[PDB]
RNA sequence: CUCUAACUAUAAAAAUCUCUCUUCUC
RNA sequence: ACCCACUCGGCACCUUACGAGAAAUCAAAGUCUUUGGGUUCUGGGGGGAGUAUGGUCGCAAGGCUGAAACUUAAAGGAAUUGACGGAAGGGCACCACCAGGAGUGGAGCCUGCGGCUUAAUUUGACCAACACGGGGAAACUCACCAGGUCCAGACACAAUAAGGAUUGACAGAUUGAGAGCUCUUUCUUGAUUUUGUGGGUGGUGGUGCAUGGCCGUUCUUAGUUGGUGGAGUGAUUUGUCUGCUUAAUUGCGAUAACGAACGAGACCUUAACCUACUAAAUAGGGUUGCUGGCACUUGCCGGUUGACUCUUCUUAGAGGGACUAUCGGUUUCAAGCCGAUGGAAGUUUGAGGCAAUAACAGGUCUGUGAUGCCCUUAGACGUUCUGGGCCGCACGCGCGCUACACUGACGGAGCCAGCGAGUACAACCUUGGCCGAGAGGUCUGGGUAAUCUUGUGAAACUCCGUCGUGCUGGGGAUAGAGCAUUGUAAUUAUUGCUCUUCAACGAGGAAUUCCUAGUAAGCGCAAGUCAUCAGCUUGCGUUGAUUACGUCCCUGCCCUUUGUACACACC
RNA sequence: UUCGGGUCUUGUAAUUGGAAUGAGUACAAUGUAAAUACCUUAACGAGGAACAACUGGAGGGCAAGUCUGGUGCCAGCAGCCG
């Protein structure tokens, strides 16, 4: 297709010369992403799922104008996830700005082993939890091949995670699907956020992406 | 959309289509498509913008 | 709107007239003279021409062709 | 300007003696039957009635005690049927 | 880098309302 | 007794989320899916119901304890956007008011509705229906009614059928008809047709609650919208606002907002002003001719398509001109407001034309050969012809017209416009000359138009007289008779004209309409309807004011704040 | 070069052929106290292989129709919303 992609941001800027080369760079330095084409340069096979279209209103005084809210989550299926919610006037267009708000806000999991370790990780490394609105969603580490144990949202969102064996459990009003999709949203985005004994050691604080290519930035 | 698409892909500065009647439903509809920007008052609507309205027949 | 009835007529019919067709009805013009010479029963109009035959209803001839011009006492 | 219906085949005229609530009105049907009567569909809240209106009404070989009105006539084709006379005569409804 | 001043002052009456609600998918 | 610092304990308070909550919010309502400091009481959808019963306390009132049968898909909490408020703040509007003007509502009539009536009195609208559908219909229109015609039923197939599928008709009965519509008789005509099936057309037939288009209205107000960004879990919100200013979401600005888009403005038409340009026998003027008259001084008022010359007015092109220009006040001194002067013009210069998002179950199938569906499609709801109706009349209502008189009516005389329009394959605008008292008639001549009607010599108005407060010379409705015009046709009076009867009407209750400057109002003319007909409408001009130059009191509109048990939204 | 052989395969057609088999009957024998029945097995036993698979549903919850005809807030459907 036609695509240009002038880059107006400085991580944007490195990343279309190429010089950052792992999405892993942008998310260990809290890089903000502002521009959803770096995650298409990093990330080339992120497929998606319109989870929800929802018909929302708003009362004026001719008529009732009506908006769709479209509940998109993005993934590669290897431990990368992002969960764009929009509301837009046509259904295309609000599924469109879903996408793209989810590729703006793809986040980084930490699977883990639910007992010995003989392989890749197949489950998440601790229990997690998180709570949107009412909703809390709590994510439990389950032996290999168990499948995932979720709803059929979580479900879809797990697999697009790469989770591939995790037990569920949700407590509140797990009917709204955006409230429920963002709580495990924040659950699979803290699995990154426990400190775990293997993780304990110090490291040596390698210097930004952004402070040793500054000259790459800059369009002069 | 195809037809804005095309439209403003042959340098034009704002279109817009009305299409209004029985779309897909026994209620009367009328879907509103536009990009650009169009004017409405003075003889700019007559100088510049140009419209055409026609009748479709379906089943 | 409009509330309209079955129309209700008080006249019995009017049928179409059917015209009276006559089987072997042109031999009746003519007459042989006995393997020879022919004449005609009916009377020749003067203003279409020979063979256009007059029409005898009562104390009249009456024709055909020109049949509004032509109604002659007998 | 509309034609007026005739009963058939199980449907006869009454009066409204007294309306009572939640749409229900007690009828004199004309074989001495003074029977309940249920406002019922394309009458609910299109047309109006008031008491002492002619009314026409259907039957329920089920149970003879209720009865389903259907079609109300407008105090001028009520005289229509006062004059051929499929009710009964000995009775006065005037304005 | 020093600071507490101006102001009023209106109450009459008004009860009720028969329908009908209609899809968002690139 | 204060002041400074500290500490313990108490009622409290401000900021904030880095914690918690469905949120409003909480420094506890935190330390709760990373769930366990001790402990008591209470709740398991709403209603029935804190009811009955049984205890128990009380003199009594009543307290404590306290269900079920049954019924129900919700009841409820917080918040968001609207709508509403006889809630608040700030601004607006003569479809609001104040100060007024002219009125309507009282009377006649004309027209449009309702109702009644009728064979039919065809129908759609009930601020935003009612002189509206261009709806001033005698025929047509037409859609209604009583009747009479025809197929303008393509096409395919079958069927008859060229020893006749069929068509048409003189004359008579019949008919309203000179209709071969139907019959009496017969004659004519040739494969186009006729009778059955499918199908198709036609329909001012139904459904604007199936639709398009258009228009009207919400809403003449200034209001809408999305892209990145911020706040919310969210519906949503900020941008779109505390102020001041504006006709304006118009600007000055302040700012989790920054840039933008539509609307407003800008823009076009029109009305001005152009002794500046270009010019003009289809517009005007001067000088001079050739004349007329009067004056007698060389001058006045005229006529001529004779000449020369000019463009001030009349035209229409390119342009100019006003941008609140200068000055004075007032303004966080900024947006802007007020005043004076110069100006043609200083209300956005006046008046308009387009005129946003969203919507109405607003109207229109009756404008469309726009149209989906339904109905009908042969004695038809198709089409045409004749006649009637759309106009009836015990009655209510809505636009108006003429009036109730002296600022007048009636006679004479004066004599003043601007928009228009006008004949060809038809017959229009009509001058002028003769007739008639008039309407009108006739004979000629111009004009396919700055040329001719036409300077549309219009009315109101002005001057001089008659009338004289008397329903009178006001008012001219209702009728009688006659004369003409258009029309195939005028009765149920088309319309005009002549003579007569001359009715109600004494400035019109409650109530209610429109309008702030060449405006209202008075007065007419042109154009659209038009063969003839306006009391209608759209435009134009004549005479031309009183009273405001403000307000939110009534009726509403815009923004903000607040409350809501409303969202089919205070009907 | 349009093709197009179908070069390589996979379905749809009341076309069309040859196989295999029971569900049934049934010599036997096994079975059983005696018999059924099962396991084995002679001889028969499939062409529309009529030797014929129903029960519910097709708006959502919840997989599957905004196909045709009928009824028009009736008849009825619907566990709830409808
Ligand atoms: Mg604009
Ligand atoms: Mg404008
Ligand atoms: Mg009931
Ligand atoms: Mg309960
Ligand atoms: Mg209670
Ligand atoms: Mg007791
Ligand atoms: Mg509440
Ligand atoms: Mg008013
Ligand atoms: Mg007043
Ligand atoms: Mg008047
Ligand atoms: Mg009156
Ligand atoms: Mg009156
Ligand atoms: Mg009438
Ligand atoms: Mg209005
Ligand atoms: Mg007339
Ligand atoms: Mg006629
Ligand atoms: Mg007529
Ligand atoms: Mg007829
Ligand atoms: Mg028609
Ligand atoms: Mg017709
Ligand atoms: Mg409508
Ligand atoms: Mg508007
Ligand atoms: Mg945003
Ligand atoms: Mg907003
Ligand atoms: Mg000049
Ligand atoms: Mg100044
Ligand atoms: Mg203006
Ligand atoms: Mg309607
Ligand atoms: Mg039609
Ligand atoms: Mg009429
Ligand atoms: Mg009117
Ligand atoms: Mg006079
Ligand atoms: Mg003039
Ligand atoms: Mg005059
Ligand atoms: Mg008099
Ligand atoms: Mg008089
Ligand atoms: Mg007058
Ligand atoms: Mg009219
Ligand atoms: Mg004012
Ligand atoms: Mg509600
Ligand atoms: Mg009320
Ligand atoms: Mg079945
Ligand atoms: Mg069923
Ligand atoms: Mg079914
Ligand atoms: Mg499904
Ligand atoms: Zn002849």
Request: with cysteine; glycine share 10%; proline share 4%.
């Amino acid at each position: 297709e036609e695509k240009g992609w002038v880059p107006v941001t400085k991580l944007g800027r490195l990343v279309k010369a190429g010089k950052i080369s792992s999405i892993e760079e942008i998310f260990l330095h809290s890089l903000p992403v502002k521009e959803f084409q770096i995650i298409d340069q990093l990330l080339p096979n992120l497929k998606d799922e319109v989870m929800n279209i929802k018909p929302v209103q708003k009362q004026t005084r001719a008529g009732q104008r009506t908006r769709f809210k479209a509940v998109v989550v993005v993934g590669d299926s290897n431990g990368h996830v992002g969960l764009g919610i929009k509301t837009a006037k046509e259904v295309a267009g609000a599924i469109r700005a879903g996408i793209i708000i989810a590729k703006l806000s793809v986040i980084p999991i930490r699977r883990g082993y639910w007992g010995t370790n003989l392989g890749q990780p197949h489950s998440l490394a601790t229990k997690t939890s998180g709570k949107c609105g009412s909703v809390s969603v709590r994510l439990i580490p389950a032996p290999r091949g168990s499948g995932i144990v979720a709803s059929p949202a979580v479900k879809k969102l797990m697999q697009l995670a790469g989770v591939e064996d995790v037990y569920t459990s949700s407590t509140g009003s797990t009917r709204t699907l955006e409230n429920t999709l963002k709580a495990a949203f924040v659950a699979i985005g803290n699995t990154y956020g426990f400190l775990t004994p293997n993780l304990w050691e110090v490291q040596a604080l390698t210097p930004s992406p952004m402070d040793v290519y500054a000259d790459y930035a800059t369009a002069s | 959309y195809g037809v804005v698409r095309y439209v403003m892909e042959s340098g034009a500065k704002g279109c817009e289509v009305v299409i209004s009647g029985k779309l897909r439903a026994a209620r009367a509809k009328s879907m509103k498509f536009a990009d650009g920007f169009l004017i409405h008052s003075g003889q700019p609507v007559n100088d510049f913008i140009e419209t055409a309205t026609r009748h479709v027949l379906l089943r | 709107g409009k509330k309209r009835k079955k129309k209700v007529y008080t006249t019995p019919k009017k049928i179409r007239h059917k015209h009276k067709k006559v089987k072997l009805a042109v031999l009746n013009y003519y007459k042989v003279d006995d393997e020879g010479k022919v004449a005609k029963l009916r009377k020749e109009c003067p203003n279409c021409g020979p063979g256009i035959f007059l029409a005898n209803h009562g104390d009249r001839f009456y024709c055909g062709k020109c049949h509004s011009t032509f109604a002659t006492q007998k | 300007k509309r034609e007026l219906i005739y009963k058939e085949e199980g449907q006869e005229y009454a009066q409204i003696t007294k309306m009572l609530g939640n749409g229900r009105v007690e009828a004199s049907c004309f074989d001495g039957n003074k029977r309940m009567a249920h406002i019922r569909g394309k009458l609910r809240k299109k047309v109006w009635m008031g008491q002492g209106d002619i009314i026409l009404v259907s039957l329920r070989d089920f149970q003879d005690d209720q009865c389903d009105v259907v079609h109300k006539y407008n105090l001028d084709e009520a005289r229509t049927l006062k004059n051929q006379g499929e009710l009964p005569e000995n009775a006065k409804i005037n304005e």
